[PDB]
Amino acid sequence: MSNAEAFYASIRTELESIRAAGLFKNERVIATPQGARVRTTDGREVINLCANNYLGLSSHPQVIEAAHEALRTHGFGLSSVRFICGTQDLHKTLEARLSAFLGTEDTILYGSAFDANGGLFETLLGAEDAVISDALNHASIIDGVRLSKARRYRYQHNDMDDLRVQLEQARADGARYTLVFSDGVFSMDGTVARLDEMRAICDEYGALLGIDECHATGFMGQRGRGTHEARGVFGKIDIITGTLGAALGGASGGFTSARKEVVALLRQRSRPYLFSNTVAPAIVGASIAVLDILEASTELRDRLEGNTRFFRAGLDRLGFDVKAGDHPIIPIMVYDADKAQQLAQRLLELGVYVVGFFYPVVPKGQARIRVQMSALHDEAALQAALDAFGQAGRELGLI
Amino acid sequence: MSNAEAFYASIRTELESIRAAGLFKNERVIATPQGARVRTTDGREVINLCANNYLGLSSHPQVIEAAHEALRTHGFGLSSVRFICGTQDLHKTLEARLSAFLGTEDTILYGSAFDANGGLFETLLGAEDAVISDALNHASIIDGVRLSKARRYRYQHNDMDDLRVQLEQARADGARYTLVFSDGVFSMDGTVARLDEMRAICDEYGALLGIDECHATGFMGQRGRGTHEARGVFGKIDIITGTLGAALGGASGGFTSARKEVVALLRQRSRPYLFSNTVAPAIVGASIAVLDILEASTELRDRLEGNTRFFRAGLDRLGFDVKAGDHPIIPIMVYDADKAQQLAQRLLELGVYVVGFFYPVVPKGQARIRVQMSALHDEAALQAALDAFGQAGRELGLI
Ligand SMILES: CC[C@@H](O)[C@H](NCc1c(COP(=O)(O)O)cnc(C)c1O)C(=O)O
Ligand SMILES: CC[C@@H](O)[C@H](NCc1c(COP(=O)(O)O)cnc(C)c1O)C(=O)O
């Protein structure tokens, strides 16, 4: 029995036990563009309440046509990293508009938020330095930190007192520079970081504050600029990392926006920036028009707030443990992974597209459905969906 | 002086330190689509010989039109990882086409080749297993290995006897499974991994064989299938990672190709596939068009081979060191960084766009210019660049 084939057997044995534990993820094949309603290849058309299409720009006609013109004017692929021959005027234009949009002096584009985080800490920090992370920080942040030589501390989830204990200890352990880093809005539970307390606690110790803004840019704040606008620190952030693939288009790309020494050093030394393809001209192009939309009127994010409150207060009145609020991410815990596959399946049958969240996406035994609001939803969809949740929740024992 | 501001000072000190060493990289701002000739925002038209656009597909109008069609039928962005609502029929289809093209059972799409490597080793390997890398492996492989728990070995560049010395130690050290991993075609020197030998070495020790094919897929091997085709080992590769951002379109996205059960574990556990956006609809649909183009005729790859055989023989007949290979990557070693900044800039005055490679992209003391050949270059541009190389080659002491 060969060594290579025992490996493949090991892998097959692993797959089985993932299925046994109710943890195997099955892909639905959508046959349509992204939007408020969606159709799998099988033919069924369902309400989509689990996309990152927070502002509904993934298939917004003026975003689609801006990408079209980018294809005409600036081509399909650049097949280069930025410093070689992958820099077009659009990249410089969009890095500018984001810096303006976000409150920072420059911005550096990446292929994703995942790679913006991956290349952040290693380039800026060393073994003598520290990174303090909220316990539930996103996997891409944990992997950025793992790739750096910095010392690591976690503070308990959104616990501002534990943030002080770690900052105390890191000072005590002798940290040169400290960077406090956290999801702006957290992926799996929707809660909002307390950037107002943190920027103050960071100011006592001289620490830096960085935030991952994927679940905030475009629709958090009065003018949609970020979680920092929503906590009144706009322009007081050392490091923003974020995506172009959530609210701002949903195609690809990410970014780090920081002072200008940072951005300049990231361009010089950040590994994904040096070593991975530049963003495609269509994406950069359509993102520049995305910023034209959101800077011209706050309506879409306003309709998002409305859709979110209506549906959060609705799931509340049905007995779900969902607080009233304006978090477009609405977590619905079912703990059992199998009971998550069922609830998502049953809600499919009832006309609602959600997907189970289980390990390793969330901790074993803390499985959930993550509802996700859009500006796209009209009230007969939000209503027909509330119906779907009340029934399937009743059948499965959730209310 | 506060700690935060102290940190910014260290950033600018190293920003100035990097300029002082002449190691600072300045972005040239292309104003046109990627092409064999390109115009900076200054209006000057120049011959591009430093892109990964080997087959000219980056602005190929049939590729461009497939992106136009994929936007109309399938939208701009999906704003979701694959397992939630980011799997369209296109991704499944493109995944079947890459597997058949490449000789493998299945294929998993990533947002870049960077992330394909980044999510590869940590998923398939454990503390008891070994990875054995060619010492010149791409930065994305190193980081993917650093993110895994496996035991690490490096062997001298293309050194088959060093490769055996490591597999001895890996086994001596008690490795369970063992993965030999190397660039198929090395980005920085154009050399071609000795895959037929490595397959034989691996069979002996019972190790898996993996290749990163970013500089091979589409044009290496008689049918452009890649380094494994070119070395008689088509169909006998355990793991292919790669990119859609070079010869297969140049826009965005990457992949890992392997057996069904390896790919299935990557879908269930690979961190960038779980936690980062799915490839955009327009990119997937254009990639499907790229495979129709390349499966229909080995022109382009035949044309590429010609253009390089001519341009190598060009610098051949001028006292340039044609160091190693038939390959479209022509490394013109100049060792000193400042000279490569000079030679790249001087050629820009002679009408040639080409860029200096120096630390940390290439080792200190081993700076260079990477000439990269495309199918697109017409004879006018070719021998016109041969002249600009001859002039500046003598003009700056290298000829
Ligand atoms: C100067 C920067 C170079 O590293 C670059 N190559 C990028 C690259 C990647 C990342 O591919 P992605 O773009 O992330 O899909 C993965 N593997 C290999 C073997 C590569 O050569 C180039 O040839 O310009
Ligand atoms: C189930 C997978 C989720 O983690 C996923 N997160 C994507 C994500 C990334 C990667 O962003 P990119 O897509 O690579 O730009 C970076 N930071 C944060 C805070 C994120 O939430 C989501 O919420 O859909």
Q: Which of B326, B324, B339, B325 is closest to B369 using CA atoms? A: B339
Atom of ligand 1 nearest to the CA of B187: 21
Closest CB from A67, A205, A206 relative to B282:
A67
Residues of A with CB below 8 A from B14's CB? 265
**Ligand 2: which residues within 6 Å by Cβ?**
A 52, 112-114, 138, 140, 183, 187, 212, 214-215, 243, 245, 254, 361; B 81, 274-277
Q: How many CA atoms lie within 13 A of A291 on its CB side?
A: 19
Closest CB from B124, B249, B274 relative to A77:
B249
Q: Which of A150, A107, A238, A268 is closest to B6 using CA atoms? A: A238
CA distance B192 to chain A (A): 20
Residues of B with CB below 8 A from A355's CB? 83-85
Please give the order of strands across the beta sheet that includes B239-243: B106-110, B254-258, B239-243, B208-212, B178-183, B130-134, B151-155
Q: Which of A323, A25, A288, A55 is closest to B86 using CA atoms? A: A25
Burial label, B79 (beta-carbon count in 10 A; 0-12, 13-18, 19+): buried
Q: Which ligand is nearest to the CA of A360?
A: 2
Measured in Å, residue B114 CA sits from the centre of ligand 2 at 16
Cβ-Cβ contacts under 8 Å for B83 (sequence gap 6 or more): A25, A26, A27, A355, B267, B274
Backbone angles phi, psi at A240, to 5 degrees: -110, 130
Q: In this complex, do A35 and B75 lie within 8 Å of one another by their Cβ atoms?
A: yes
Instruction: Answer yes or no: are the C-beta atoms of A65 and A369 closer than 8 Å.
Output: no
From-to residues of CATH 3.90.1150.10 in chain B: 22-56+300-395
Which residue, among B41, B54, B73, B80, would best test binding to A if mutated, counting the most A CBs under 10 Å from its CB?
A: B80
- Chains A–B, number of C-beta pairs less than 8 Å apart: 347
Copy the structure tokens of residue A101. 């949009």
Which residue, among A45, A252, A369, A374, would best test binding to B if mutated, counting the most B CBs under 10 Å from its CB?
A: A252
Residue from A112, A185, A192, A214 whose mutation best tests the ligand 2 pocket (most atoms within 8 A of CB): A214
Which residue, among B23, B52, B58, B76, would best test binding to A if mutated, counting the most A CBs under 10 Å from its CB?
A: B76
Whole-number Å distance between alpha carbons of A27 and B203: 35
Whole-number Å distance between alpha carbons of A269 and B396: 28
Please state, in angstroms and as integers, the Cα–Cα distance from residue B143 to each residue in A186, B123, B200, following that order. Answer: 26, 14, 27
Q: How many CA atoms lie within 13 A of A272 on its CB side?
A: 33
Cβ of residue B254 lying under 6 Å from some atom of ligand 1: yes
Q: Which ligand is nearest to the CA of A190?
A: 2
Q: For residue A33, is the peptide bond before it cis, meaning its omega torsion is within 30 degrees of 0? A: no
Whole-number Å distance between alpha carbons of A383 and A62: 28
Q: What is the DSSP secondary structure assignment for residue A219, as one 8-state letter?
A: T
Atom of ligand 2 nearest to the CA of A252: 15
CATH 3.30.465.10 fits A61-296, yes or no: no
Instruction: Answer yes or no: are the C-beta atoms of B138 and B212 closer than 8 Å.
Output: yes
The angle at the Cα of B299, spanning B295 to B300, to the nearest 5 degrees, equals: 100
Burial label, B164 (beta-carbon count in 10 A; 0-12, 13-18, 19+): middle
The DSSP H or E segment spanning B16 is: helix B3-20
Closest chain B CA to residue A77 = B251
Whole-number Å distance between alpha carbons of A242 and A191: 17
Instruction: Answer yes or no: are the C-beta atoms of B149 and B194 closer than 8 Å.
Output: no
Closest CB from A30, A48, A247 relative to B88:
A30
Q: For residue B360, is the peptide bond before it cis, meaning its omega torsion is within 30 degrees of 0? A: yes
Can you tell me which residue has the tokens 């069609």? B69
CB atoms within 10 A of CB A41: 13
From-to residues of CATH 3.90.1150.10 in chain A: 22-54+298-396
Q: In this complex, do A32 and B64 lie within 8 Å of one another by their Cβ atoms?
A: no
Whole-number Å distance between alpha carbons of B151 and B158: 20
CA distance A391 to chain B (A): 22
Q: What CATH architecture applies to the domain A22-54+298-396?
A: Alpha-Beta Complex (3.90)
Percentages of chain A per state (helix, strand, coil), in multiples of 5: 45, 15, 40
Instruction: Name beta bridge partners: A181.
Output: A133, A210
The angle at the Cα of A383, spanning A327 to A305, to the nearest 5 degrees, equals: 25
From-to residues of CATH 3.40.640.10 in chain B: 61-296
Distance of CA B276 to the CA centre of its chain: 21
Copy the structure tokens of residue B90. 């296109």
Instruction: Answer yes or no: are the C-beta atoms of A52 and A244 closer than 8 Å.
Output: no
Closest chain B CA to residue A29 = B88
Copy the structure tokens of residue A291. 């910023």
Please state, in angstroms and as integers, the Cα–Cα distance from residue A307 to each residue in A54, A249, A303, A378, following that order. Answer: 11, 19, 6, 8
Copy the structure tokens of residue A248. 């701002």
DSSP of A229-245, one letter per residue? HHTT-TT--SEEEEESS
Whole-number Å distance between alpha carbons of B345 and B392: 10
Closest chain A CA to residue B180 = A4
The DSSP H or E segment spanning B367 is: strand B367-372
Distance of CA B352 to the CA centre of its chain: 22
Q: Is A328 helix (H, G, I), strand (E, B) or coil?
A: coil
Q: Is A151 helix (H, G, I), strand (E, B) or coil?
A: strand
The angle at the Cα of A45, spanning A40 to A49, to the nearest 5 degrees, equals: 90
Whole-number Å distance between alpha carbons of A165 and A191: 22
Instruction: Answer yes or no: are the C-beta atoms of B186 and B136 closer than 8 Å.
Output: yes
Instruction: Answer yes or no: are the C-beta atoms of B224 and B301 closer than 8 Å.
Output: yes
Q: Which of A142, A104, A98, A99 is closest to A120 using CA atoms? A: A142
**CA gyration radius for chain A?**
22
Copy the structure tokens of residue A112. 């994703």
Cβ-Cβ contacts under 8 Å for A36 (sequence gap 6 or more): A47, A48, A56, A374, A376, A377, A378, A381
CB atoms within 10 A of CB A322: 21
Cβ of residue B112 lying under 6 Å from some atom of ligand 1: yes
Copy the structure tokens of residue A11. 């892998």
Q: How many CA atoms lie within 13 A of A203 on its CB side?
A: 9
Q: What is the DSSP secondary structure assignment for residue B57, as one 8-state letter?
A: G
Instruction: Answer yes or no: are the C-beta atoms of B192 and B158 closer than 8 Å.
Output: no
CA distance A11 to chain B (A): 7
The angle at the Cα of B76, spanning A290 to A104, to the nearest 5 degrees, equals: 30
Whole-number Å distance between alpha carbons of A118 and A28: 29
Whole-number Å distance between alpha carbons of A106 and A89: 15
Q: Which of A331, A358, A333 is closest to A186 using CA atoms? A: A331
Whole-number Å distance between alpha carbons of A214 and B81: 13
Q: Is B68 helix (H, G, I), strand (E, B) or coil?
A: helix
Copy the structure tokens of residue A253. 């790309």
Q: Is B154 helix (H, G, I), strand (E, B) or coil?
A: strand
Single-letter amino acid, residue B189:
D
Q: In this complex, do A114 and B111 lie within 8 Å of one another by their Cβ atoms?
A: yes
Q: Which of B340, B339, B351 is closest to B382 using CA atoms? A: B351
Can you tell me which residue has the tokens 């607080």? A323
Whole-number Å distance between alpha carbons of A368 and A315: 15
Atom of ligand 1 nearest to the CA of B140: 16
Task: Find the length of chain A.
Answer: 399
DSSP of B257-302, one letter per residue? EE-HHHHHHHHHH-HHHHHSPPPPHHHHHHHHHHHHHHHH--TTHH
Q: In this complex, do B83 and A267 lie within 8 Å of one another by their Cβ atoms?
A: no
Backbone angles phi, psi at B269, to 5 degrees: -130, -10
Cβ-Cβ contacts under 8 Å for A396 (sequence gap 6 or more): A334, A339, A342, A343, A346
Tell me which long-range contacts B192-196 makes (C-beta under 8 A, separation of at least 24). B192/B220, B192/B227, B192/B230, B192/B231, B192/B325, B192/B327, B193/B134, B193/B158, B193/B227, B193/B231, B194/B158, B194/B160, B194/B231, B195/B227, B195/B228, B195/B231, B195/B233, B195/B237, B196/B231, B196/B232, B196/B233
Copy the structure tokens of residue A214. 């994927």
Distance of CA A193 to the CA centre of its chain: 14
Whole-number Å distance between alpha carbons of A144 and A28: 30
Distance of CA A387 to the CA centre of its chain: 28
Whole-number Å distance between alpha carbons of A5 and B323: 39
Cβ of residue B114 lying under 6 Å from some atom of ligand 1: yes
Whole-number Å distance between alpha carbons of B98 and B90: 12
Cβ of residue B227 lying under 6 Å from some atom of ligand 1: no
Closest chain B CA to residue A274 = B361
Can you tell me which residue has the tokens 């039928």? B73
Q: In this complex, do A115 and B114 lie within 8 Å of one another by their Cβ atoms?
A: yes
Whole-number Å distance between alpha carbons of B117 and B144: 5
Q: What CATH architecture applies to the domain B22-56+300-395?
A: Alpha-Beta Complex (3.90)
Can you tell me which residue has the tokens 């055989």? B309
Measured in Å, residue A287 CA sits from the centre of ligand 1 at 24
Q: In this complex, do B27 and A60 lie within 8 Å of one another by their Cβ atoms?
A: no
Whole-number Å distance between alpha carbons of B375 and B102: 21
Q: In this complex, do A282 and B251 lie within 8 Å of one another by their Cβ atoms?
A: yes
Instruction: Answer yes or no: are the C-beta atoms of B220 and B230 closer than 8 Å.
Output: yes
Whole-number Å distance between alpha carbons of A223 and A226: 8
Q: Is B105 helix (H, G, I), strand (E, B) or coil?
A: coil
Whole-number Å distance between alpha carbons of B323 and B98: 32
Enumerate the H helices of chain A as residue ranges. 3-20, 61-74, 89-102, 113-118, 121-124, 139-146, 160-172, 195-205, 227-230, 261-269, 271-275, 281-296, 299-317, 337-349, 379-396
Closest CB from A77, A114, A361 relative to B272:
A114
